[PDB]
Design a protein around this ligand. Structure first.
Ligand SMILES: *SCC1=C(c2ccccc2)C(C)(C)N(O)C1(C)C
Ligand SMILES: [Cl-]
Ligand SMILES: [Cl-]
Ligand SMILES: [Cl-]
Ligand SMILES: [Cl-]
Length: 164
């Protein structure tokens, strides 16, 4: 297991534009296209992202290319953020992946605002952090995925992704 395999499990793989858990147009491995309710706006974003006229369909190679960029973007987001970087730097590689996962799903500023959870993670209060993270819109709207991510922070193991 690693961040790529982890997010591949959590985001799935679809080659046609579809609506994500929030109802937003997405493609590939959780590549969010736009929050706009316009399918044409989503198609425009996709064509721009891929560099060709796709009409809402991409190849597996193209999906993986966007995925690599998005994972890279999540890491860069963490490193440039004054709140996220110290927590990230303080963690082992398994827990770093859990933080990247959160950033990928909710964005840099989204995770950066979880002040109390971040403090508990920084302090290595793993059970407390885990309990605190569950007190969130995130956990309530995507509980199975949140449970996996939280287990990763609680244990520092890949146990939640083993038989997946
Ligand atoms: S969500 C954090 C809370 C608790 C806790 C859970 C696991 C480890 C440490 C603390 C506790 C004590 C059950 N609780 O009532 C909190 C503050 C809601
Ligand atoms: Cl998804
Ligand atoms: Cl704890
Ligand atoms: Cl809550
Ligand atoms: Cl879920």
């Amino acid at each position: 297991m690693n961040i790529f395999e982890m997010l591949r499990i959590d985001e799935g793989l679809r080659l046609k534009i579809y609506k994500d858990t929030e109802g937003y147009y997405t493609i590939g491995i959780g590549h969010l296209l736009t929050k706009s309710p316009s399918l044409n706006a989503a198609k425009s974003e996709l064509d721009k992202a891929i560099g060709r006229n796709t009409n809402g369909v991409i190849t597996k190679d193209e999906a993986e290319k966007l995925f690599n960029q998005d994972v890279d973007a999540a890491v860069r987001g963490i490193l440039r953020n004054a709140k996220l970087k110290p927590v990230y730097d303080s963690l082992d590689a398994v827990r770093r992946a859990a933080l990247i996962n959160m950033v990928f799903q909710m964005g840099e500023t989204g995770v950066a605002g979880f002040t109390n959870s971040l403090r508990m993670l920084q302090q290595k209060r793993w059970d407390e952090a885990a309990c605190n993270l569950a007190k969130s819109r995130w956990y309530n709207q995507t509980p199975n995925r949140a449970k996996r991510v939280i287990t990763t922070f609680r244990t520092g193991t890949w146990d939640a992704y083993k038989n997946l």
